[PDB]
């Protein structure tokens, strides 16, 4: 399956909507930006579950002073996908891989 | 297989039971919400319930741990050994027809 | 076939009559030590992980495969080892 | 397929460029011997063919100097750079070659 | 193929050499024994010349262990402590086919 690089930046007032016209999106790591203030950050991913109902999960919790980067080592998800932050001014960078077969 | 997103929130007084074709639960992340030990109970080789510590999180030290695809065969029970929480578990539900 | 496996480290001898896939080591300075066979047919002592309460109490092994029999022990310093039994 | 070692060094005034089926499985990003925030970024092809830059990792000596991307696969050509931090910063990983 | 346990102790003064029915070294974890330490692994590259790459950088007061999760290297391989007094423990898998 062909692999491409994928990246996006998420802030307090901005979410990412990964949409496709089989495709898969696995997240390698989530990183904190230089300008992020000293407070907690929590990343959420919304996708499809087995019961045909959209769900929310917390991808990771990052903090500047504790753990600036948290690698999910490829958190595979079927698109469409929604990435959001519930707290933190950001920016936060989600780096993943877009797999198309 | 079929890849679906799965997530749950665990507290001191709230367990989670995963029950459900072949199904698997691939945990990847356990993150502290806004000393917390997560326990997973499932079947062992010899056929009895077994309690294992999935991860330990702490606000001051490490709020999130990546299991890198900890596979479990359902049914499963996720609980918090200690700490009020909340603690968010996120992973992959694998369904094979 | 995958089964959930765990133990608390005092030694632990895992023997089944198979593969043992270590995933996580958690704290309840500590070092987790593993004994199993090498290529040259001699046992070897290796540090699976080094943990400390105040700097990090958890380590993810990401599926460290070992062929049984194996022995786990605590070199220095309770801790919990969790992983998968594969048949 | 064929598994070779790969490593490179990045600084404020030095980025690295990878040209050559070939693949780059980045494994670890480490801080060198020589307190500010460090950000390591990689840019490569997107699905629409538009070069995009993705923050590989954020490191800091006093908080955590090493990050493992567990083989983060990226198709060459690639460019790795430092958004911030004086460096030096070491990137290591695999080079996959298929005959 | 077959997998065996593998490990070594890297000293500040003494490096470790690995030589050898096709064999791989799947490095898993690098840890501190009982200052700033850096581990280096050298082997062949795609141009047929040895290279130096930093496996990890460890410090007692920040984080004394890091897991690479299957860093595969084709032998022969040389591991060495670029800096730090050590000792440093390397653990991993030796894969034989």
Numbering used by the authors:
A (entry chain D): 14 to 34, 39 to 118
B (entry chain E): 14 to 33, 38 to 51, 57 to 119
C (entry chain A): 15 to 23, 27 to 34, 40 to 50, 57 to 105, 108 to 117
D (entry chain C): 14 to 33, 39 to 52, 55 to 119
E (entry chain B): 14 to 33, 38 to 51, 56 to 118
The paper states:
To better understand how the CTD associates with other parts of NPM1, we turned to cryo-electron microscopy (cryo-EM). Using physiological conditions (pH 7.5 and 150 mM NaCl), we obtained electron density maps that allowed a reconstruction of the NTD with a resolution of 2.6 Å. Comparison to the crystal structure revealed a virtually identical fold, including sidechain orientations, except for the loop covering residues 34 to 39, which makes up the A1 tract. In the X-ray structure, it is stabilized via crystal contacts with the neighboring pentamer. In the cryo-EM density maps, the loop is too flexible for a confident reconstruction, suggesting that not only the A2 and A3 tracts but even the A1 tract in the NTD is disordered. Free CTDs attached to the disordered linker are too small (less than 9 kDa) to be resolved on their own. Interestingly, we obtained two distinct 3D classes, one with an additional density above the acidic side of the pentamer, off-center from central cavity. Strikingly, nearly all particles in this class had another NTD pentamer in the proximity. The extra density is connected to the pentamer via the A2 tract of a single NTD and can therefore not be attributed to the disordered regions of each protomer. Placement of the top-scoring complex between the CTD and the A2 tract into the EM map showed a good agreement between the unassigned density, the helical acidic region of the IDR, and the approximate location of the CTD.
